[PDB]
């Protein structure tokens, strides 16, 4: 019988779909429409784990809801694939958004394809071959996007983000995130925390803010008004329907947006 593979987040649906092709079923643990930051496990979803053979986990802080779901299920001892086993993690609390990096995605894809190959040896060769072809497309995505960068960002080019999602993404450009607006992962800032953030943006002369496309924040225009910073939006790859192509479609948009913020910070003759 065909493997039934549980996934927790949209990038993982894309990774597994691209690895298995038509040789296994990819099943989301939470229905399309839920914000995974806000999701609380339902009996309906807990029941579905009983029909699965394995669950692929981010397991580094972005799907603790999944481990609770499995604990409360008919199958508490279900095999689990820890996708981030070989991924260098930053760092205290680990930033769990490793899926928003092309290089960490490739590492994750390879770990998953290997682990799935052991559970289903009949399709192991297909899983390994598909992982290699998906990785090749991912490297090309990054290469084409980085080639459009005329210059590296200037020394004073400082970046802020609303959600703490993009440290792994910006590392691909050799950049760091100067400040994150949300005080903690998926936590909304209070008026005093937002004032503190604005003071920091001004004091450190932060040039750009990457806001959320997926579940936008209501306070973003105040930050832009009060600090004069340029606004660009990025995708956490957490909204809408699950699809095999979702990850590369949205990562291509994310890389192009980062390139555009860097080119737009570049001055000409004056
Ligand atoms: Ni997040």
**C-alpha of residue 35 to centroid of ligand 1, in Å:** 10
**C-alpha of residue 10 to centroid of ligand 1, in Å:** 12
How far is it, in rounded angstroms, from Cα 112 to Cα 168? 19
In the chain, where the domains are located: 1-152, 153-270
| Residues in contact with 66: Cβ distance below 8 Å, sequence separation at least 6, in sequence order | 6, 8, 29, 55, 57
Report how far Cα 195 is from the mean position of its chain's Cα atoms.
28
From first CA to last CA, the distance across the chain in angstroms is 68
How far is it, in rounded angstroms, from Cα 21 to Cα 125? 12
**C-alpha of residue 150 to centroid of ligand 1, in Å:** 31
228-236 long-range contacts, CB within 8 A, separation 24+: 229/160, 229/201, 230/261, 230/264, 230/265, 232/208, 232/257, 232/258, 232/260, 232/261, 233/257, 234/161, 234/165, 234/166, 234/169, 234/210, 234/258, 236/97, 236/100, 236/163, 236/165, 236/212
Run of H or E residues at 67: helix 64-71
**C-alpha of residue 185 to centroid of ligand 1, in Å:** 6
**C-alpha of residue 186 to centroid of ligand 1, in Å:** 6
DSSP per residue, 201-237: HHHTT--EEEEESSS--TTHHHHHHHH--EEEEE--S
Q: Which residues of 76-102 are buried (b: 16+ CB within 10 A; e: fewer)?
A: eeeebbbbbeebeeeeeeebbbbbbbb
Task: State both tokens at 32.
Answer: 């399309």
DSSP per residue, 72-128: TSS-TT--EEETTTTS----------GGG-HHHHHHHHHHHHHHHHHH-GGGHHHHH
- Resolution number, Å: 2.0
How far is it, in rounded angstroms, from Cα 97 to Cα 84? 10
How far is it, in rounded angstroms, from Cα 152 to Cα 139? 19
For the sheet containing 25-28, what is the strand order? 25-28, 4-7, 54-57, 80-82
> What is the four-CA torsion angle of 19, 135, 248, 78, rounded to 10 degrees?
40
For the sheet containing 208-212, what is the strand order? 179-180, 159-161, 208-212, 230-234
How far is it, in rounded angstroms, from Cα 163 to Cα 185? 7
CB 217 within 8 A of CB 162: yes
Report how far Cα 214 is from the mean position of its chain's Cα atoms.
12
The residue to which tokens 């994150």 are assigned? 180
User: Gaps in the chain (C–N > 2.5 Å) come after which residues?
Assistant: 91
State the structure-solving technique.
X-ray
**C-alpha of residue 255 to centroid of ligand 1, in Å:** 18
**C-alpha of residue 142 to centroid of ligand 1, in Å:** 22
**C-alpha of residue 193 to centroid of ligand 1, in Å:** 19
**C-alpha of residue 187 to centroid of ligand 1, in Å:** 10
How far is it, in rounded angstroms, from Cα 231 to Cα 86? 34
CB 77 within 8 A of CB 51: no
What are the two backbone dihedrals, phi and then psi, of residue 56, each rounded to the nearest 5 degrees?
-85, 125
Closest of 122, 81, 109 to residue 251, by C-alpha = 109
Specify the pairing of strand 159-161 against strand 54-57.
Answer: unpaired
Q: Is 10 a known ligand-binding residue?
A: no
Which SS3 state, helix, strand or coil, does residue 54 take?
strand
What are the two backbone dihedrals, phi and then psi, of residue 161, each rounded to the nearest 5 degrees?
-130, 155
How far is it, in rounded angstroms, from Cα 234 to Cα 251? 9
| Residues in contact with 91: Cβ distance below 8 Å, sequence separation at least 6, in sequence order | none
* Sign, CA torsion 66/71/73/76: positive
């Amino acid at each position: 019988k065909r493997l039934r593979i549980g996934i927790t987040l949209h990038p993982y649906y894309s990774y597994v779909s691209n690895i298995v092709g038509d040789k296994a079923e990819v099943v989301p643990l939470i229905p399309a429409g839920f914000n995974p930051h806000a999701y609380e496990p339902r009996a309906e979803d807990i029941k579905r784990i009983g029909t699965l053979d394995v669950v692929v986990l981010n397991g580094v802080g972005h799907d603790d809801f999944a481990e609770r779901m499995i604990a409360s299920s008919e199958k508490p001892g279900i095999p689990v694939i820890e996708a981030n086993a070989k991924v260098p993690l930053l760092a205290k609390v680990v930033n769990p958004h490793t899926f928003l990096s092309i290089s960490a995605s490739i590492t994750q894809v390879n770990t998953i394809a290997r682990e799935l190959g052991k559970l289903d040896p009949a399709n192991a060769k297909a899983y390994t071959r598909n992982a290699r072809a998906y990785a090749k497309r991912l490297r090309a995505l990054r290469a084409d996007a980085l080639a459009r960068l005329n210059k590296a960002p200037a020394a004073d080019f400082r970046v802020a983000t609303i959600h703490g999602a993009y440290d792994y993404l910006l590392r691909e450009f050799g950049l760091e995130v100067t400040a994150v607006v949300e005080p903690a992962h998926g936590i909304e800032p209070s008026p005093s925390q937002l004032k503190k953030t604005i003071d920091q943006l001004k004091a450190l002369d932060v040039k750009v803010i990457f806001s959320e496309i997926d579940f936008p924040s209501t306070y973003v225009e105040t930050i832009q008004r009060e600090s004069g910073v340029k606004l660009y939006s990025l995708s956490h790859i957490s909204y809408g329907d699950y699809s095999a192509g979702k990850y590369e479609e949205e990562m291509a948009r994310n890389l192009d947006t980062v390139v555009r913020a860097i080119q737009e910070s570049g001055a000409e003759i004056l």
